[PDB]
A paper describes a structure:
Among the most effective bacterial resistance mechanisms are β-lactamases, a family of enzymes that are divided into four distinct classes. Classes A, C and D (serine-β-lactamases, SBLs) use a catalytic site serine residue to initiate inactivation of the antibiotic, while Class B (metallo-β-lactamases, MBLs) relies on a Zn2+-activated hydroxide. MBLs contain catalytic centres that can accommodate two closely spaced Zn2+ ions bound in the α and β sites with similar yet distinct sequence motifs (B1: His116, His118, His196 and Asp120, Cys221, His263 (i.e., HHH/DCH) for the α and β sites, respectively; B2: NHH/DCH; B3: HHH/DHH). For B3-type MBLs two variations of the canonical active site motif have been observed, QHH/DHH in GOB-1/18 from the opportunistic pathogen Elizabethkingia meningoseptica and HRH/DQK in SPR-1 from Serratia proteamaculans (variations shown in bold).
B3-RQK MBLs have three distinct aa variations in the active site motif, including two in the β site. We determined the crystal structures of the mature CSR-1 protein and CSR-1trunc, and compared them to structures of B3 and B3-Q MBLs. However, no metal ions were observed in the crystal structures of CSR-1 and CSR-1trunc, suggesting reduced metal ion affinity. To probe the role of these residues single, double and triple mutants of CSR-1trunc (i.e., CSR-1trunc,sm, CSR-1trunc,dm and CSR-1trunc,tm) were generated to create variants where either the α, the β or both metal binding sites are identical to the canonical B3 MBL motif. These mutations had no significant effect on the overall structures, however, in CSR-1trunc,sm electron density indicates the presence of one bound Zn2+ in the α-site, while in the double and triple mutants both the α- and β-sites are occupied by Zn2+ ions. The increasing Zn2+ binding capacity of CSR-1trunc as a function of introduced mutations was paralleled by enhanced ex vivo and in vitro activities, especially for the double and triple mutants; importantly, these two variants are also resistant to CA. Thus, the variations in the β-site of B3-RQK MBLs are responsible for the loss of catalytic activity and sensitivity to CA. When the weaker bound metal was removed (from the β site), a stable enzyme-inhibitor complex was only formed in CSR-1trunc and CSR-1trunc,sm, indicating that CA inhibits B3-RQK MBLs by displacing Zn2+ from the low affinity β site. Mutation of the B3-RQK active site to restore the native B3 motif resulted in increased metal affinity, catalytic activity and resistance to CA. This can be primarily attributed to the restoration of the canonical histidine in position 263 of the β-site, and raises the possibility of modifying CA to effectively bind in the presence of His263, thereby increasing the therapeutic range of this widely used antibiotic resistance drug.
Author numbering: 15 to 273
The structure:
């Protein structure tokens, strides 16, 4: 029922020329539109897939014009709807190796959740490597591997046609994670530390994240509706996101080491 609250619909809107929000109240889904086809970053829950397509069409765009679907990490609140969106799309799915493996499993054998939260399996069509780039209609999409929350967690850097940089950040949360000598994910700590360094060295004009509460979705949305054209321009958003995630992580790790 917390996913129920996260999946409450929002009216789609423009974040920026060529950048559209088509997700829910707290589960992000971003459509990048170009004259050569579109990119969809993340999907949400399987139950929200009809709402996502519905949102895309309410903006005046066609599912058949979506060429790529990118995934941040392969859990149900972001990959759950990809299977059906892929089918309605004909699009090719992009994801890191570890995300591809988990998505083929339907979310099962999660290093922390086991088989607790499955979703429709997906076949990834294009395996993403760190720093790999895709070009479409003047837009560039680049993968930034940011593991920690999951072994394959991926952030996404978009260079828009107008030259401005967008960063779609994956989660860095580790609630309830065993951080010291984790049997199922032994490289977690070094992974998340490299992720902090990678993200904090990234310049950004438009800061987004796969959970709306973490980049002020509802506040920025209301502000833009009232006429603030640049409400989603947030050049300090990623630095603050990393600082607060790192602060919480180091406190959690310090507590785990103080047995
Ligand atoms: Zn997650
Ligand atoms: Zn989760
Ligand atoms: Zn999530
Ligand atoms: Zn692979
Ligand atoms: Zn494999
Ligand atoms: Zn199993």
């Amino acid at each position: 029922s917390l996913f129920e609250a996260w999946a409450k619909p929002v009216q789609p809107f423009a974040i920026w020329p060529g950048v559209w929000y088509v997700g829910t109240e707290n589960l992000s889904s971003v459509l990048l539109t170009t004259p050569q086809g579109h990119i969809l970053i993340d999907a949400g829950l399987d139950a929200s897939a009809p709402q996502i397509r519905r949102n895309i069409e309410a903006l005046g765009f066609r599912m058949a014009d979506i060429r790529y679907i990118a995934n941040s990490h392969a859990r149900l609140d972001h990959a759950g709807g990809i299977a059906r969106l892929k089918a309605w799309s004909g699009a090719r799915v992009i994801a890191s190796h570890a995300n591809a493996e988990q998505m083929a499993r339907g979310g099962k054998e999660d290093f922390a959740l086991g088989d607790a939260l499955p979703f429709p399996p997906v076949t990834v069509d294009m395996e993403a490597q760190d720093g790999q780039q895709w070009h479409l209609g003047g837009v560039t999409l680049a993968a930034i591997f940011t593991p920690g929350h999951l072994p394959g967690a991926t952030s996404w850097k978009v260079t828009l046609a107008d030259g401005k940089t967008l960063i779609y950040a994956d989660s860095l949360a580790t609630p309830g994670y065993p951080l010291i000598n984790n049997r199922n994910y032994p490289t977690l700590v070094e992974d998340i530390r490299r992720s902090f360094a990678r993200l904090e060295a990234q310049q950004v004009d438009i800061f987004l994240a796969n959970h709306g509460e973490r980049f002020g979705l509802m506040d920025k949305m209301a502000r833009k509706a009232r006429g603030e054209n640049n409400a989603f321009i947030d050049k300090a958003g990623l630095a603050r996101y990393v600082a607060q995630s790192r602060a919480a992580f180091e406190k959690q790790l310090a507590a785990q080491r103080a047995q």
